[PDB]
Design a protein around this ligand. Structure first.
Ligand SMILES: OC[C@H]1O[C@@H](O[C@H]2[C@H](O)[C@@H](O)[C@H](O[C@H]3[C@H](O)[C@@H](O)[C@H](O)O[C@@H]3CO)O[C@@H]2CO)[C@H](O)[C@@H](O)[C@@H]1O
Ligand SMILES: OC[C@H]1O[C@@H](O[C@H]2[C@H](O)[C@@H](O)[C@H](O[C@H]3[C@H](O)[C@@H](O)[C@H](O)O[C@@H]3CO)O[C@@H]2CO)[C@H](O)[C@@H](O)[C@@H]1O
Ligand SMILES: OC[C@H]1O[C@@H](O[C@H]2[C@H](O)[C@@H](O)[C@H](O)O[C@@H]2CO)[C@H](O)[C@@H](O)[C@@H]1O
Ligand SMILES: OC[C@H]1O[C@@H](O[C@H]2[C@H](O)[C@@H](O)[C@H](O)O[C@@H]2CO)[C@H](O)[C@@H](O)[C@@H]1O
Ligand SMILES: [Br-]
Ligand SMILES: [Br-]
Ligand SMILES: [Br-]
Ligand SMILES: [Br-]
Ligand SMILES: [Br-]
Ligand SMILES: [Br-]
Ligand SMILES: [Ca+2]
Ligand SMILES: [Ca+2]
Ligand SMILES: [Ca+2]
Ligand SMILES: [Ca+2]
Ligand SMILES: [Cl-]
Ligand SMILES: [Cl-]
Ligand SMILES: [Cl-]
Ligand SMILES: [Cl-]
Ligand SMILES: [Cl-]
Ligand SMILES: [Cl-]
Lengths: 599, 599
């Protein structure tokens, strides 16, 4: 089968890849640093392969993580993953508490259009754009926030989360309107309305407190749910998801009240997902056996359903129904992990032939605001469940396909609960030395070329690069040195002041200084090129990743002695721009790349 | 009717505006310097409003100026213009001799297509492009060169001119082909063929030598001349012009031999030009009275025929014919001078309401390869006869109209000879102080703007301009100074070494240095911006006429003393670029523009 413990390990790690700054000390991702530190609310998760904090799918995802712990936290101790899941969840819940603004909440950080227009790493995005925030009291988003904190308070034994959960619930339930929820439009619009979120939140508050007032509230919301088409049944032909949690709330109410109506719903809905269907009606299935709800993120929907199915089956006694729901659930998870017509994992860094080009900016690690360069991802986004194949099982691993190769908090969330269930049952041993170290590239370096050369001068075209990625970062006090040998000038009967330093081109907006020619030792001299605000050299675009200077060092015109062939920093240069080690880069007084004459 | 001596004075001065480098000592044009000094053959005239040396019209123009002297040289001594005409002619003839290559000649300098694509002054064109030369033995071009030298040898009493007239004629007569005359195609293509040039050259050689053999040659060419349409007559329904000199040749042979065939031709030809016409055939006439041969350079054709008409009338005795031809001649010239429906001169810088926007590069004096800027010409192209009006006497003085407002060597050539005839008869007094000095604008200067101001720095955007025009020219050792008062620095406890100079932008290809901050006197200091090869600041285009530099002069970050309001070079600067006199420009050690503190 699969190593379900390893899959869970990675599936949890994914959330560490998504953390906004400040990072917790326990963050295990070597290519992530503090990012978006000027955000109006710190911490929390970037939503997908972007850098927007969208509170609806964020809170949804945390609620699902808390649900996993609530069902199976004791059952996953063997795998060693319980503590990882717990602290990863607190990280998000802390963000939700931090969004509190009294009569409203911060519900979004980032303008989605502007965020999406740019391709580059989290840690440098503030060099590209200012990130706005948005405040309101939308019942769906605030209700999902309440739900997340309620389940959170239970599994994390935390009074503060419970107090915020109640506050948020009262706010959503007083407001009864999504009219102040605007900034997520077209990305995470409230399609189903807010009645499902009030149901889901009050259900979890009932589970957290035992106060039957919340049970009464919860049940009072079920006649407000959307109907299946034009019938009197509650809608069941869809998945538990970021926009609609009434599905799982009904399952939770089945077990807590034992009432018939909730079991009838549960089995109607779950039946529609199974290959056997509900009275001849069923979700689309690929020939390969994937329950395929929609073009967008079909694995997300099916793996979340596998979780609901495991929980409902674990909660009933009928062996026929248990087997049917268990076999549906395991079949969807196993599809995602490799049991499909291509025998390939749809989880990054897991299993056989996993996706290698997820639509994920920071894991990609470009310097150029381009998706095609670099042609391979510089980092491994371990654990990320991709969108998945089409209705016909077709799929290509292509960074451009944000439909099939998107990754997201909400994709991973229900998938994590399902993997908890499968680990509990089959165990497995998590990877010992995970995550292993990545192969790194040079991050700060000069590329140089002989721009023009004559028998009295050397002209150098120098581009000081910031292509950092481990993590992408900014360095203000950047400089580099050009080392020369003046033996031939002295031997011909000339001196240092016979040699003059000039500039032939200085890139606009890169405030720059060049030192006088300076003695190092013997006949070896150098100039330092210093950028006053080196942070403007950053991997955010075609123009910004490198600063260009053209400088000339010249002997008096007409003369013939100049010999650049013995100059340390001239070594290996051609007419073509290339990386060189012999023009070393410094951060303040510390050399960070290259070599120096002697030492 | 007009001050013909003044018109003649100016018409000759036009050729001095046309001269290529090296210019003779006696050149009277303040806005012309040595130009195109890298040409394969030096001297000669730029053809038109451009900078090509086109040997066919150049030599034709020379031959015509020679003819003027031949007929009316003694008669114009009263005008004071004989010497001026003679040395101007000698200038062009010297060029024709210098074109000798033995079995071939240089017949063109500059590529017409390449030259005409660019709009700027003669003296800076080598910064723009590299000029080719062309060699061949075209019978028309070699023949015309021979003719010019043959007449020149007479009027200037010069054995070398005769020697080369004979050389070129023998080459043109042995080759009998225009096949190697290709470089001027589309500009000065040989349309008529070469038989007319051989007839013209051999006629002038006969008049120079008295050698009967040249007469026999000349007469032997007459059967090869083009016919008039389908008929038996030699073509008569055009003008003597750069392409076809058989008209003047027949007039010369009429007088030399007295033969009836030549007299018959001349009268037929001249009748076709007169208002009475020739047996019902006539050149087009504008209602205002201009014989209008063609939309291109109509004044050129009419005024050349005025000269031929004067010469033929002065050579016969029939009183009716004399009066008919003289009336025709004087009426064409007077039209050009202002006897027209607009009562306006079509000679630049002469008479009432003359043209002010001729199609002439160097006279315009741009700095940025545009016709429309500056909107008034910087220089007065005295004496230039423009193309002239349309068929209905319409005309607008528009730089863009290269049909109506073109000027050229051949436009002025016949014209000069006709003005010689008129001043001979009516005299007139030439202008005593001609040419008077031009009003100049500033040529080298800084435009500056406050690029950014802060409580601890000044940042300047500075453009060092070369919009030279009197004459357009190149300066290598260009620099300018930025002056500051550092009183507030010292009063706050800081030193000169606490003030840092950086660069925020340096235009590509402009080798520049900036001095350390330098003491002038008291608490006045400066930095000198020096361009190592300032000849790259030149008025040849939008990028070239100025070098942009952004520099910053900064006290430490955090300090509050910096005060630009007492800095000499800050006076008057705003956030928009403007010329400033307080950032003086230097050529080497010489201040060429602006003011210095304490002076
Ligand atoms: O009407 C059918 C069901 O619709 C459900 O809402 C879905 C929207 O109709 C669907 O367009 C949307 O898709 C998202 C996708 O979830 C996300 O991963 C991607 O980035 O953006 C897509 C485009 O917006 O998904 C939602 C939720 O699945 C209702 O929730 C449900 O009640 C209704 O039956
Ligand atoms: O075909 C009739 C006559 O043509 C004469 O040639 C002229 C060309 O036909 C005409 O196109 C050319 O026009 C020049 C113009 O003179 C010049 O100022 C301008 O810059 O460019 C135009 C294109 O070259 O003029 C020539 C000369 O008049 C023949 O010489 C003549 O024999 C013939 O009957
Ligand atoms: O919203 C769908 C999808 O969009 C992704 O961004 C686009 C962006 O919309 C467009 O402006 C830019 O030109 O191309 C990018 C890359 O496709 C975004 O990256 C995804 O997160 C999102 O699912
Ligand atoms: O040959 C006709 C006429 O052309 C003029 O040059 C043009 C040039 O051909 C074109 O490339 C450019 O765009 O505009 C200029 C000005 O019209 C040339 O200046 C004349 O001397 C010439 O008679
Ligand atoms: Br609000
Ligand atoms: Br590993
Ligand atoms: Br080293
Ligand atoms: Br005057
Ligand atoms: Br201070
Ligand atoms: Br002064
Ligand atoms: Ca909803
Ligand atoms: Ca050396
Ligand atoms: Ca001809
Ligand atoms: Ca000051
Ligand atoms: Cl990968
Ligand atoms: Cl690559
Ligand atoms: Cl040849
Ligand atoms: Cl008449
Ligand atoms: Cl003028
Ligand atoms: Cl102007």
């Amino acid at each position: 089968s699969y190593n379900y413990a390893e899959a869970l390990q990675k599936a949890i790690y994914f959330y560490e890849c998504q953390q906004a700054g400040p990072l917790p000390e326990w963050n295990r991702v070597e290519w992530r640093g503090d990012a978006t530190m000027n955000d109006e609310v710190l911490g929390g998760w970037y939503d997908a392969g972007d850098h927007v904090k969208f509170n609806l799918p964020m809170a949804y995802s945390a609620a699902m993580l808390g649900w996993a712990l609530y069902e199976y936290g004791d059952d996953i101790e063997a795998s060693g993953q319980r503590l990882h899941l717990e602290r990863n969840l607190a990280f998000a819940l802390d963000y939700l508490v931090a969004c509190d603004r009294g009569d409203s909440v911060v519900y979004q950080i980032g303008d989605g259009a502007a965020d999406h227009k740019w391709w580059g790493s989290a840690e440098v995005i503030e060099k590209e754009m200012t990130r706005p925030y948005f405040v309101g009291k939308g019942s769906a988003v605030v209700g999902q926030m309440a739900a997340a904190l309620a389940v959170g308070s239970i599994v994390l034994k935390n009074d503060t989360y419970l107090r915020y959960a109640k506050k948020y619930f009262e706010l959503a339930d007083a407001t009864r309107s999504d009219s102040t929820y605007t900034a997520a439009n077209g990305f995470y619009s409230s399609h189903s309305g807010f009645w499902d979120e009030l149901l889901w939140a009050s259900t979890w508050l009932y589970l957290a407190t035992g106060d039957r007032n919340y049970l009464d509230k919860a049940e009072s919301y079920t006649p407000k749910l959307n109907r299946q088409n034009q019938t009197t049944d509650i809608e069941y032909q869809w998945a538990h998801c970021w926009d609609d949690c009434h599905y799982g709330a009904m399952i939770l109410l089945a077990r807590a009240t034992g009432k018939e109506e909730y079991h009838k719903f549960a089995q109607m809905h779950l039946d529609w997902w199974t290959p056997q269907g509900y009275n001849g009606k069923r979700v689309a299935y690929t020939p390969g056996g994937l329950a395929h709800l929609d073009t967008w993120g079909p694995l997300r929907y099916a793996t979340t359903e596998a979780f609901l199915a495991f929980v409902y089956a674990d909660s009933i006694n009928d062996p026929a129904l248990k087997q049917k729901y268990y076999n549906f659930a395991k079949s969807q998870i196993d599809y995602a992990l490799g049991s499909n017509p291509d025998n390939r994992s749809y989880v990054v860094g897991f299993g056989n032939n996993p996706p290698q080009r997820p639509h994920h900016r920071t894991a990609h690690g470009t310097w150029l605001d381009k998706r095609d360069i670099p042609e391979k991802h510089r980092h491994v986004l371990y654990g990320a469940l991709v969108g998945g194949p089409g209705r016909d099982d077709s799929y290509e691993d292509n960074i451009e396909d944000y439909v099939k190769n998107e990754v997201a908090c909400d994709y991973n969330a229900g998938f994590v609960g399902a993997l908890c269930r499968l680990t509990a049952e089959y165990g497995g041993t998590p990877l010992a030395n995970f995550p292993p170290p990545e192969q790194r590239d040079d991050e700060f370096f000069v590329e140089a070329a002989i721009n023009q050369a004559s028998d009295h001068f050397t002209e150098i075209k120098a581009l000081l690069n910031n292509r950092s990625s481990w993590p992408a970062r900014l360095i203000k006090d950047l400089s580099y040195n050009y080392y020369m040998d003046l033996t031939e000038v002295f031997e011909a009967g000339y001196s240092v002041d016979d040699i003059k330093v000039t500039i032939g081109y200085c890139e606009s907006g890169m405030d720059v200084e060049i030192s006088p020619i300076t003695h190092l030792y013997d006949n070896i001299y150098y100039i330092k090129i210093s950028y006053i605000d080196g942070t403007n050299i950053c991997p955010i675009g075609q123009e910004q990743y490198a600063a260009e200077l053209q400088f000339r060092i010249a002997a008096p015109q007409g003369t013939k002695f100049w010999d650049p062939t013995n100059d340390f920093s001239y070594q290996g240069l051609t007419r073509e721009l290339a990386k060189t080690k012999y023009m070393p880069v410094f951060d303040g007084a510390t050399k960070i790349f290259g070599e120096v004459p002697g030492g």
